[PDB]
Amino acid sequence: GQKVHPNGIRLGIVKPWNSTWFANTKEFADNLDSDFKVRQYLTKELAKASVSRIVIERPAKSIRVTIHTARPGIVIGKKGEDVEKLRKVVADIAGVPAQINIAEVRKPELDAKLVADSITSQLERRVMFRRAMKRAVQNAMRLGAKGIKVEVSGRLGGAEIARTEWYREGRVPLHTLRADIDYNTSEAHTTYGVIGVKVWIFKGEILG
Amino acid sequence: EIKELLKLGDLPTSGQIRLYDGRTGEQFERPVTVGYMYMLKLNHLVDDKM
Amino acid sequence: KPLVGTGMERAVAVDSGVTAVAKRGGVVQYVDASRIVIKVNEDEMYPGEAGIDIYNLTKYTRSNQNTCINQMPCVSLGEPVERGDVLADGPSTDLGELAL
Amino acid sequence: GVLKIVKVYLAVKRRIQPGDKMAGRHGNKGVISKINPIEDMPYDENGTPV
Amino acid sequence: GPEEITADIPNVGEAALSKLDESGIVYIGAEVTGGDILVGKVTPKGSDVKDSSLRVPNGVSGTVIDVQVFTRDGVEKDKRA
Amino acid sequence: RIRIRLKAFDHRLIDQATAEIVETAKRTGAQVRGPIPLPTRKERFTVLISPHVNKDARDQYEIRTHLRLVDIVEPTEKTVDALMRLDLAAGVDVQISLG
Amino acid sequence: TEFLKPRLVDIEQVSSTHAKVTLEPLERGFGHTLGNALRRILLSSMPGCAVTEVEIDGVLHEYSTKEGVQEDILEILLNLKGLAVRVQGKDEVILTLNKSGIGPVTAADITHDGDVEIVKPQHVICHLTDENASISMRIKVQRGRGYVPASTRIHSEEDERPIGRLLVDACYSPVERIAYNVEAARVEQRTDLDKLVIEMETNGTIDPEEAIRRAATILAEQLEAFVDLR
Amino acid sequence: ATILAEQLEAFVD
Amino acid sequence: TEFLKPRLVDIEQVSSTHAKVTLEPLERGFGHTLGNALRRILLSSMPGCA
């Protein structure tokens, strides 16, 4: 289990946190649990909507969710009909006043998580994994990624002996802390088993 | 009656006020006419013709 | 509201049916978000059919020349109106006058 | 006959710009040429721009 | 065959599925301009798909104020209808 | 005197908050004490990173809780109330205490 | 070189908004030069805060209508575009307006923070008629200069904002009307000097000596390109 | 230019 | 709130008593401010002897 998590190593420097609140040792665990719940719910709901990052932020006994999604239109539905609906359920989950914001993700080919999800979907609907991977890589490159890597693993083409294959393009420096490396993962629950998809997308280096 | 109504308001009787220029800050000679005309916007808009 | 008009603005803005001229006079209830609700004075009010007049405001919609025909209420809540008086200003109208 | 019938109502909001047509009530047509700043306008001695 | 109202717009990538829902058609309101997509409306056999999806004309912007649909008795997905 | 205890995980954020609070104080009232930095709590955690067994395999995390002590010496009418409407940025637990 | 220098001698406030200011003493002929230059700068380039994004709950677009109110939503956005705010510390704040009950919604009902000051407590926005009606809008107040409109600010905005935030045009300049007069100065030994009587009319948010100081710094730093380089 | 700058040199920041 | 400082791009010296100070770029409605201020000072205030 060689490698360090690329997001996790960079949280202090170039990457920010998702859950962004303060709490004392008393209420912290509970808060975490709540976050887990709400996030889980959101994932369940907005599966068909291309959702990248849920950012929870709770000040003053009131939860502020921020959903980063590629297509707001399907998450919002009719203007303030679906969002509103989501909100009350979120509140219920939390046990506090809820507030949902929806950030529009520019360039969903450069968002790593989204790409991973897409790949997983493709796998599920029985495409050639390799061709999917290629598409993922190519598209990102076209869009202006300084580099991208993707990796898929296990029961590829329903083969008895599992293996991993991966496509890199451009440069993807992981040891370099100041590199904006959007990393994320997904899992294709195929007929032969799970197929795990990792993808690293290098936006560029930050100078500060 | 236009002149008499312009005398009820504190405006000059001729209908004409001396106007300065916003560019140069100096007076236009020979005082000009200022008033309120009811101007309409017709539906021949330029970004339907370009 | 044309400062220099001819006084024929009133007749054109009423007689062309773009404003919501009151059918029966009286006061007002003014729910109005959806409709003007006018309580009718008793002299103009029928014995049966107790009756209060509910005017439908046509909000933002397409005209024949792609302009916007829109009606806005020009009376407040709890305010007397008479028969033939205007209640909602149409497109290009200002308090029952004619503002092109 | 017709199967899929989806009508979508856009609403553009057009402002005013160099090239539109304005007119008074007397036959004075005009194509609005320059949209000046407030400062360059001819102001009378009271201070109001025209 | 008949044409179809689906967001699963082809060739064109993550620049189709945007001002719409998961089942197709513009999602109402929005700051739509020119070259956008309002109603995904494309058929298969017309690797032989095309883009008749009624889009926004060139040069115009606006806000979708209203969407009317008295469509072919079936327009619904599994349930908005 | 109003003692104010700012607590947060992000230091920059905390700093920002403190400045804001000072600003709020200084316009209305007079003689703001100052933004005094107390000691940071570095609550560390070790965990085994293997699912099953490998004990020398470990990750050592920590949460740096920063403290900022802002004090206000003269509470006026205008000043104290100003904070009611003036909420601070999220992820910064404030703790005002008069006397 | 027998020139002099002027000072702001008397600053009278006729009201909270309309306020004159003298300048004394000016040299011969300089009066119309400084007056016209300060007029052009004070009308074009002053910083003032204004309403930029309005966020009402249970709304789809700005051309809808709402439950329990008089003005429609375009009327509300116009009456909010006329608002006059004066922040001190930050350059981008978010206010809150919450009110229920029958009666008009003044600008004095906004739940203010500490560093924002709403200087028009009789600015009307809504006319709530139903007692079961409510309205909860969240305004966003930036700070800039000039005129930046909704069309250009439709793609200029970088911070990917969510959908549902109505965009209001930004009228940033808090100066609306300015006139200067070149009188005859009352100098006890000189007769060839003059005073400049600038008669400002502000939005209430700007302080006139601060505005004159900023316009003077703008003019001096623009002329430094002539002074230093050639 | 320096005449006007020294004329306006009084009330600047 | 930051302003555009220019660069003095040209002194086309036609003769020893001639110049043309091409100068760019300024904020909208500032060329007239600088030009009119310099013109009035150079006309009626610049010291010298004759």
Tab-separated table of C-alpha atoms in Angstrom, chain A residues 54-208:
chain	number	residue	atom	x	y	z
A	54	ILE	CA	-20.075	18.436	-1.223
A	55	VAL	CA	-18.651	21.141	1.052
A	56	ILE	CA	-20.301	21.356	4.491
A	57	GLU	CA	-19.863	24.482	6.595
A	58	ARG	CA	-21.853	25.016	9.814
A	59	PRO	CA	-21.774	28.366	11.676
A	60	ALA	CA	-24.140	29.336	14.535
A	61	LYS	CA	-26.346	26.199	14.814
A	62	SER	CA	-27.168	26.243	11.085
A	63	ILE	CA	-25.744	23.983	8.350
A	64	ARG	CA	-24.519	25.471	5.037
A	65	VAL	CA	-24.053	22.844	2.305
A	66	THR	CA	-22.325	23.706	-0.973
A	67	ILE	CA	-22.817	21.188	-3.800
A	68	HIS	CA	-20.256	21.370	-6.615
A	69	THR	CA	-21.995	19.857	-9.659
A	70	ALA	CA	-21.377	19.888	-13.438
A	71	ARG	CA	-25.069	20.370	-14.304
A	72	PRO	CA	-26.969	22.545	-11.765
A	73	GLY	CA	-30.124	22.379	-13.933
A	74	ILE	CA	-30.906	18.736	-12.952
A	75	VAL	CA	-30.011	19.382	-9.236
A	76	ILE	CA	-32.070	22.603	-9.127
A	77	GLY	CA	-34.813	21.283	-11.459
A	78	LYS	CA	-37.413	24.050	-11.694
A	79	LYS	CA	-36.131	27.272	-10.077
A	80	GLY	CA	-36.074	26.566	-6.321
A	81	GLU	CA	-38.240	23.418	-6.380
A	82	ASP	CA	-35.716	20.593	-6.071
A	83	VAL	CA	-33.131	22.544	-4.081
A	84	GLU	CA	-35.802	23.518	-1.562
A	85	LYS	CA	-36.892	19.892	-1.261
A	86	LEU	CA	-33.298	18.825	-0.672
A	87	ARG	CA	-32.875	21.477	2.003
A	88	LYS	CA	-35.598	20.301	4.372
A	89	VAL	CA	-34.326	16.725	4.213
A	90	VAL	CA	-30.791	17.966	4.888
A	91	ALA	CA	-32.088	19.907	7.886
A	92	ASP	CA	-33.869	16.805	9.161
A	93	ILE	CA	-30.688	14.773	8.791
A	94	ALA	CA	-28.741	17.400	10.717
A	95	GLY	CA	-31.373	18.574	13.220
A	96	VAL	CA	-30.721	22.273	12.443
A	97	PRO	CA	-31.657	24.979	9.887
A	98	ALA	CA	-30.241	24.003	6.468
A	99	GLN	CA	-28.952	26.117	3.577
A	100	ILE	CA	-28.007	24.564	0.211
A	101	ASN	CA	-25.770	26.389	-2.266
A	102	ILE	CA	-24.959	24.935	-5.715
A	103	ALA	CA	-21.603	25.718	-7.364
A	104	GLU	CA	-21.448	25.146	-11.134
A	105	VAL	CA	-18.419	23.039	-12.132
A	106	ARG	CA	-16.714	24.551	-15.191
A	107	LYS	CA	-14.992	21.832	-17.287
A	108	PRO	CA	-16.257	18.471	-15.900
A	109	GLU	CA	-13.566	16.659	-17.960
A	110	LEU	CA	-10.886	18.289	-15.755
A	111	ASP	CA	-12.668	17.407	-12.487
A	112	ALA	CA	-11.145	14.090	-11.467
A	113	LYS	CA	-13.987	12.649	-9.408
A	114	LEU	CA	-16.505	13.313	-12.163
A	115	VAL	CA	-14.239	11.621	-14.699
A	116	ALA	CA	-13.878	8.609	-12.415
A	117	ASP	CA	-17.645	8.402	-12.023
A	118	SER	CA	-18.095	8.549	-15.790
A	119	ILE	CA	-15.559	5.765	-16.248
A	120	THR	CA	-17.359	3.638	-13.665
A	121	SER	CA	-20.662	4.208	-15.444
A	122	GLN	CA	-19.100	3.186	-18.747
A	123	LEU	CA	-17.720	0.025	-17.162
A	124	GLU	CA	-21.145	-0.801	-15.748
A	125	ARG	CA	-22.744	-0.480	-19.223
A	126	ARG	CA	-20.208	-2.956	-20.673
A	127	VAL	CA	-17.784	-0.903	-22.743
A	128	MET	CA	-14.134	-1.701	-23.380
A	129	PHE	CA	-12.481	-0.366	-20.233
A	130	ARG	CA	-9.327	0.556	-22.143
A	131	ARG	CA	-11.270	2.726	-24.678
A	132	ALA	CA	-13.023	4.469	-21.763
A	133	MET	CA	-9.692	5.147	-20.077
A	134	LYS	CA	-8.295	6.556	-23.316
A	135	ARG	CA	-11.322	8.817	-23.687
A	136	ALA	CA	-10.894	10.048	-20.125
A	137	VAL	CA	-7.248	10.807	-20.643
A	138	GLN	CA	-7.644	12.393	-24.068
A	139	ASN	CA	-10.536	14.631	-23.072
A	140	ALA	CA	-8.716	16.043	-20.053
A	141	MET	CA	-5.656	16.756	-22.190
A	142	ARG	CA	-7.810	18.547	-24.750
A	143	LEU	CA	-9.400	20.643	-22.012
A	144	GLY	CA	-6.002	21.922	-20.792
A	145	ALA	CA	-4.838	19.629	-17.989
A	146	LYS	CA	-1.083	19.938	-17.445
A	147	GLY	CA	-1.387	16.178	-16.998
A	148	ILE	CA	-3.713	13.316	-16.093
A	149	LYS	CA	-3.316	9.735	-14.935
A	150	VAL	CA	-6.090	7.151	-14.673
A	151	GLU	CA	-5.897	3.626	-13.275
A	152	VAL	CA	-8.412	0.776	-13.360
A	153	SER	CA	-8.084	-2.480	-11.484
A	154	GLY	CA	-9.615	-5.929	-11.130
A	155	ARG	CA	-11.722	-8.306	-13.247
A	156	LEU	CA	-11.072	-6.292	-16.423
A	157	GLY	CA	-13.152	-7.774	-19.249
A	158	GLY	CA	-14.543	-10.292	-16.729
A	159	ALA	CA	-11.201	-12.124	-16.695
A	160	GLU	CA	-10.575	-14.695	-13.960
A	161	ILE	CA	-7.133	-13.318	-13.078
A	162	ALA	CA	-7.557	-9.720	-11.924
A	163	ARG	CA	-5.121	-7.023	-13.009
A	164	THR	CA	-4.555	-3.274	-13.043
A	165	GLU	CA	-3.952	-1.062	-16.056
A	166	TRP	CA	-3.275	2.663	-16.147
A	167	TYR	CA	-2.858	5.498	-18.645
A	168	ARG	CA	-0.828	8.632	-17.974
A	169	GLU	CA	-0.530	11.681	-20.206
A	170	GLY	CA	1.395	14.896	-19.590
A	171	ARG	CA	3.062	15.271	-16.185
A	172	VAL	CA	1.505	14.223	-12.837
A	173	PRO	CA	3.958	15.074	-10.028
A	174	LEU	CA	2.761	13.544	-6.731
A	175	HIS	CA	5.851	14.138	-4.555
A	176	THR	CA	5.635	17.870	-5.339
A	177	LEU	CA	3.387	19.294	-2.581
A	178	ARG	CA	2.660	22.601	-4.371
A	179	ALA	CA	1.183	20.726	-7.377
A	180	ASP	CA	-2.620	21.018	-7.664
A	181	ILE	CA	-3.307	17.292	-7.983
A	182	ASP	CA	-7.057	16.677	-8.092
A	183	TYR	CA	-7.231	13.032	-7.046
A	184	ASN	CA	-10.348	10.911	-6.704
A	185	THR	CA	-11.680	7.366	-6.882
A	186	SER	CA	-14.744	5.292	-7.835
A	187	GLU	CA	-16.005	1.667	-7.978
A	188	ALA	CA	-17.819	-0.162	-10.818
A	189	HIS	CA	-20.044	-2.889	-9.372
A	190	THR	CA	-20.015	-5.089	-12.476
A	191	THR	CA	-21.396	-8.616	-13.004
A	192	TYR	CA	-17.921	-10.141	-12.471
A	193	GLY	CA	-17.091	-7.978	-9.417
A	194	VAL	CA	-15.915	-4.510	-8.427
A	195	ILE	CA	-13.595	-2.479	-10.681
A	196	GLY	CA	-11.867	0.353	-8.876
A	197	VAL	CA	-11.035	3.471	-10.846
A	198	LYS	CA	-8.470	6.002	-9.658
A	199	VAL	CA	-7.736	9.243	-11.464
A	200	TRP	CA	-5.193	11.978	-10.846
A	201	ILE	CA	-5.558	15.285	-12.657
A	202	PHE	CA	-2.741	17.807	-12.467
A	203	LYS	CA	-4.130	21.321	-12.959
A	204	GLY	CA	-0.757	23.041	-12.355
A	205	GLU	CA	1.612	24.272	-9.623
A	206	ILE	CA	0.626	27.016	-7.148
A	207	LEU	CA	3.203	29.708	-6.308
A	208	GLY	CA	2.905	31.555	-2.973
